[PDB]
Amino acid sequence: QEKSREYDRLYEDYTRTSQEIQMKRTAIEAFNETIKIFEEQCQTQERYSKEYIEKFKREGNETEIQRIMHNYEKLKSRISEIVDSRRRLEEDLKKQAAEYREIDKRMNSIKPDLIQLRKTR
Amino acid sequence: PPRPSSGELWGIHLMPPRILVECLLPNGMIVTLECLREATLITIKHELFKEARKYPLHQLLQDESSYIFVSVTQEAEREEFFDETRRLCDLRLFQPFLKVIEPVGNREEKILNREIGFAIGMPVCEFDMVKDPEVQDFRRNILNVCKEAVDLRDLNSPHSRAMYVYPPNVESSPELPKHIYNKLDKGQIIVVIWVIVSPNNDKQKYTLKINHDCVPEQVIAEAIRKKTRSMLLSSEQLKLCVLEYQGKYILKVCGCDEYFLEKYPLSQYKYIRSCIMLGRMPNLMLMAKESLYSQLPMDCFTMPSSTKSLWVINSALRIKILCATYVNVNIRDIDKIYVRTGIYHGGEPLCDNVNTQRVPCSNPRWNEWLNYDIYIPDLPRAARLCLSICSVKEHCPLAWGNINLFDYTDTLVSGKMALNLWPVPHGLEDLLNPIGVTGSNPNKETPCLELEFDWFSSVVKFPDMSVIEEHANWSLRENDKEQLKAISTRDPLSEITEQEKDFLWSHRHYCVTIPEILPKLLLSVKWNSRDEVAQMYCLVKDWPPIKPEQAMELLDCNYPDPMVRGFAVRCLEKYLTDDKLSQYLIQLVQVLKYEQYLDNLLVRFLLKKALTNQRIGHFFFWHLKSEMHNKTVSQRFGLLLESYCRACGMYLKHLNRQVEAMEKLINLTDILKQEKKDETQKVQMKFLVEQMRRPDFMDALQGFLSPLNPAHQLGNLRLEECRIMSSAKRPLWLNWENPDIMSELLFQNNEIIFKNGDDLRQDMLTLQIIRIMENIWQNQGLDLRMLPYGCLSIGDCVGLIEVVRNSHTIMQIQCKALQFNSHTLHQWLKDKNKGEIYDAAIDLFTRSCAGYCVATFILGIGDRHNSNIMVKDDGQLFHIDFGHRVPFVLTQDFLIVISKGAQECTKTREFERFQEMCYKAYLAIRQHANLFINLFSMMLGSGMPELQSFDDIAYIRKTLALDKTEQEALEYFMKQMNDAKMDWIFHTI
Numbered sequence A: 001q002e003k004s005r006e007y008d009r010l011y012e013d014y015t016r017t018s019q020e021i022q023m024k025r026t027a028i029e030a031f032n033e034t035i036k037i038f039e040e041q042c043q044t045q046e047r048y049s050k051e052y053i054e055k056f057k058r059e060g061n062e063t064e065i066q067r068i069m070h071n072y073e074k075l076k077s078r079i080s081e082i083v084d085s086r087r088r089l090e091e092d093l094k095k096q097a098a099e100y101r102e103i104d105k106r107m108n109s110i111k112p113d114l115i116q117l118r119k120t121r
Numbered sequence B: 001p002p003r004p005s006s007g008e009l010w011g012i013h014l015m016p017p018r019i020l021v022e023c024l025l026p027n028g029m030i031v032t033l034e035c036l037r038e039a040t041l042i043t044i045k046h047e048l049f050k051e052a053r054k055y056p057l058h059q060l061l062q063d064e065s066s067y068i069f070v071s072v073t074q075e076a077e078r079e080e081f082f083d084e085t086r087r088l089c090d091l092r093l094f095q096p097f098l099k100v101i102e103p104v105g106n107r108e109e110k111i112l113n114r115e116i117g118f119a120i121g122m123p124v125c126e127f128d129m130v131k132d133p134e135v136q137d138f139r140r141n142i143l144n145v146c147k148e149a150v151d152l153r154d155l156n157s158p159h160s161r162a163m164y165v166y167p168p169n170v171e172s173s174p175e176l177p178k179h180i181y182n183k184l185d186k187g188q189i190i191v192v193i194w195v196i197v198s199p200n201n202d203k204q205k206y207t208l209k210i211n212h213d214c215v216p217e218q219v220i221a222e223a224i225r226k227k228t229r230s231m232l233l234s235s236e237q238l239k240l241c242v243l244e245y246q247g248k249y250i251l252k253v254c255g256c257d258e259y260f261l262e263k264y265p266l267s268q269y270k271y272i273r274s275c276i277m278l279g280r281m282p283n284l285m286l287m288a289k290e291s292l293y294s295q296l297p298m299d300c301f302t303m304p305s306s307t308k309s310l311w312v313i314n315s316a317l318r319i320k321i322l323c324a325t326y327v328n329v330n331i332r333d334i335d336k337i338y339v340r341t342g343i344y345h346g347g348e349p350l351c352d353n354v355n356t357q358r359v360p361c362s363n364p365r366w367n368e369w370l371n372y373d374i375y376i377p378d379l380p381r382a383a384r385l386c387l388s389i390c391s392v393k394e395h396c397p398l399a400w401g402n403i404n405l406f407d408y409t410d411t412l413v414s415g416k417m418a419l420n421l422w423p424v425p426h427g428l429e430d431l432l433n434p435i436g437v438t439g440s441n442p443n444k445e446t447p448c449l450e451l452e453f454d455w456f457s458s459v460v461k462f463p464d465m466s467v468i469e470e471h472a473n474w475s476l477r478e479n480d481k482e483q484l485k486a487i488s489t490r491d492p493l494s495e496i497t498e499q500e501k502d503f504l505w506s507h508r509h510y511c512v513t514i515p516e517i518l519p520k521l522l523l524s525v526k527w528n529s530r531d532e533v534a535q536m537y538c539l540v541k542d543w544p545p546i547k548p549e550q551a552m553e554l555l556d557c558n559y560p561d562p563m564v565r566g567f568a569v570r571c572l573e574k575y576l577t578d579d580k581l582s583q584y585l586i587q588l589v590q591v592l593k594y595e596q597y598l599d600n601l602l603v604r605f606l607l608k609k610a611l612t613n614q615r616i617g618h619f620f621f622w623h624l625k626s627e628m629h630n631k632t633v634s635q636r637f638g639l640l641l642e643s644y645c646r647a648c649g650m651y652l653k654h655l656n657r658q659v660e661a662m663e664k665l666i667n668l669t670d671i672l673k674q675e676k677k678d679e680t681q682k683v684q685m686k687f688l689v690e691q692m693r694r695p696d697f698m699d700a701l702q703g704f705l706s707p708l709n710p711a712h713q714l715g716n717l718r719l720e721e722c723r724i725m726s727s728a729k730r731p732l733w734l735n736w737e738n739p740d741i742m743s744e745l746l747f748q749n750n751e752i753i754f755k756n757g758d759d760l761r762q763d764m765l766t767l768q769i770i771r772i773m774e775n776i777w778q779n780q781g782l783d784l785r786m787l788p789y790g791c792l793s794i795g796d797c798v799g800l801i802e803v804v805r806n807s808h809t810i811m812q813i814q815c816k817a818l819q820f821n822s823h824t825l826h827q828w829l830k831d832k833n834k835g836e837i838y839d840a841a842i843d844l845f846t847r848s849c850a851g852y853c854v855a856t857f858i859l860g861i862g863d864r865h866n867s868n869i870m871v872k873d874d875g876q877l878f879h880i881d882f883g884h885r886v887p888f889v890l891t892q893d894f895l896i897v898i899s900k901g902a903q904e905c906t907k908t909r910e911f912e913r914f915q916e917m918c919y920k921a922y923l924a925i926r927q928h929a930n931l932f933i934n935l936f937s938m939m940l941g942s943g944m945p946e947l948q949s950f951d952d953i954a955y956i957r958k959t960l961a962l963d964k965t966e967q968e969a970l971e972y973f974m975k976q977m978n979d980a981k982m983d984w985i986f987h988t989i
């Protein structure tokens, strides 16, 4: 009975952590898919800007070139923001998965004890 | 994967009024745009392409029309937004960004897959991603059911399509019980037929007094006679009117989407039968067949996208346990671990359980062959290996898993196999879990155990029926007949001794003459013996069909064999009415969980019926959709929902509207339960009002079909009547107008309580049981009136409750300054029903109260207060809140009413009559006990904690006195019944 009050409380943390972990896993999945899209955007920038950079270089129009650069820099900086936001989540997931293991280790110590008592009682 | 929330952004329930959206242009440019959260993609695109003119490479961009927006959803998938009518807040965006792309493939296909994926609650591309051949084979082969169903909808093209959309909601049998016939005078009904006459769309009525057995066409014929009587037409021309126009018209219930499209008698129609009962005038609306047929669209269905024999194997079963990659054990407490195994047929073992050697948890390697005392030939089709990694502290399982020893292509499983294990359930005391999910955990981030099966000469396949029949065809007294008749009558929970088991098997050939004993005979077979099973297979092949209610039991956990299940399905295919299939759909959905493989005769049957009748289709959708959170059923139900959504026609668009509405509701209630949690009702209401007023909500929640009953169109929201209920969990009382032209003649209001937080499956099941009990009583000719109100679970502890118009709890009426005596309820009824109406009201009270007194006793519904028992103005009593040694209950408050106001309420002919209703009702339910037992037993597989074992079902065995005689049961019940305000707030003394 004493151990049943805590095993039941422990399972309540096992279940939440499991839910929360599955959420983080799909958020990381969404971050990868977001990162892939932004990378795909850079390939699109190089493809189109190639013939504009080329014309302006053959024209000494250093501003219009630096203008195409400032926007590419913005796009590039944003990919760093997303990659660093994904890493922050990755390490949070790692910390939580470490917790749902220690919740488990705790449970698999109480569970064989509780089983012996229910039989005795 | 499916979305965690109903939020507008990941981790954000509600996006601000104005938000910054990163726009990724097709020229490789990034533009930050500030948008209103309620802004449509049309507006955002226009706003963007205007702004884009300011940035480099603007000259490359073609017209806004030439592009589409793409983003990543909270479901972690790349969505293409074709419908640019959708608002920023309603795209389930992961991060606030949008990409501009040139649309790629074919619109039609991508659009449908978007619409399917949304309704299911997971993208279709995820099914395409599954490499499992059984999944892909299910996807291709189920289309045969879709194509067959779509073909019957188009055979007799106009009527057949209307028949699918508006199936006659008619009673079981055309035969009326005499107590109901006596209500309609001279065996005739006064009906009112309305017409919306043009110009100015004015209403015109025609009252008709005709027989109840009248086909709707005869009802139209008599109406066209009433109209033509003044025309001076000759007898021959008058007859020709009826002859040519008798069926150029259709009948509809006023203020409802209920149509009288089939040849059934008028009284058989559920609307009409309730009117006959209630003494109400049936209001019908006449219409042109073409007026209805112009509404019907769809039916645009498009298609997507060496052997050796088992028991030629002279060997005992061998299974090699190899390695188990990790286990989370406290090495200080648990040193050794072992793999416990067992070969099972359902929940019963085929042989004694075999363990591996105890190993140190630091090295979970066994590389051991396990020897089972069973020959390979004796393995039944449905045999399974049930295993678990157990600890030695004193034993306990750590992780569990089950596998079918044969695959869907009848191939005996051979070779190496990795099995991702499932966590042990809370309260699973047993070392193994055979009535668990047979399959490897879709979560690969779990303990996985490698396995190895014997590899015989070539490919091992389960024998053909020709082979089985040939092996079977190779391998009566007076008291004996009485003994078989005794076993037959016994409820499915009554234990049959090994002596009785031997007796049934030894008399198996006679058993065919008493066919309703098939479930008792099937439990007497040694499933671990091919000698017995082959003989049983032959008996089943030529077994006479049994009632659907009997055949349903053959689909629960006790009957895993495919031949048994096949027979069961064939009985339902031959005898189950659409009325009754709708009545047992909850159980029929759960019982799919017990099927070994994805593609089976039960799924194929249920799917065809759902794609054949939209009433069935609607609830088949919602029942499956509600369980899309439970990963133990996510794939099977997901694949099933995909096949339904692909072939249901235009209904998928209505289903998407209902899903959209529910998603907003779940999100608004989550906000009230979480962020706003600690706010006063006053404050929370101001927020609710602000929120519901917003365009997106007004769009989402107005003008859709009630998920509780699609025949009810939910029009414009009556915001003044909408509120957050004072109770905990924050339920939403929502009120909608009735958009029907004749909304005045049925119901002008549509009230629903939306409740997020509580599991509504208990309530849902009890309300179904109540409906069945009423149908048993009403069929037997016992007017006992029940109110099985609408209740639907739409997901994980989210659901809807139908608000019963003109009802009050006994508590509410007691508070009508605030002085109540046990006479208060009677005084209330006396006042609400003055005159000759009084007698009728008191009668309705006694008939309804009697039904509820018996139902609640039988089921064991306790915690009954004056705040969970309600009474309609007409006098009808009914109970509410069914989330759960319960005796008979009859308050002096009720007694006073029953006894029309008398001081000695036990010594009246009223109470005598009442007691007679209770006895008759109780004995009627006891006679149909197997049905109730079977319905609850089909519910063990579902996650319902109140129904986890047969021991939980054993309560009805007690209240119905099933081991007792019928006179001993009557005596018991009569005893329970005869056994039977100041501080009503807390109850002290």
Ligand SMILES: COC(=O)Nc1ccc2c(c1)OCCc1cc(-c3nncn3-c3ccccc3Cl)sc1-2
Binding pocket: B725, B727, B731, B753, B755, B763, B789, B801, B802, B803, B804, B805, B806, B807, B808, B809, B870, B880, B881, B882
């Ligand atoms: C007309 O005046 C009224 O007060 N009507 C009314 C109120 C509540 C219900 C009802 C007519 O219809 C019957 C169905 C029903 C069912 C309810 C229920 N079921 N489970 C929990 N509840 C519940 C109880 C109290 C408050 C809210 C809820 Cl959802 S409440 C309810």
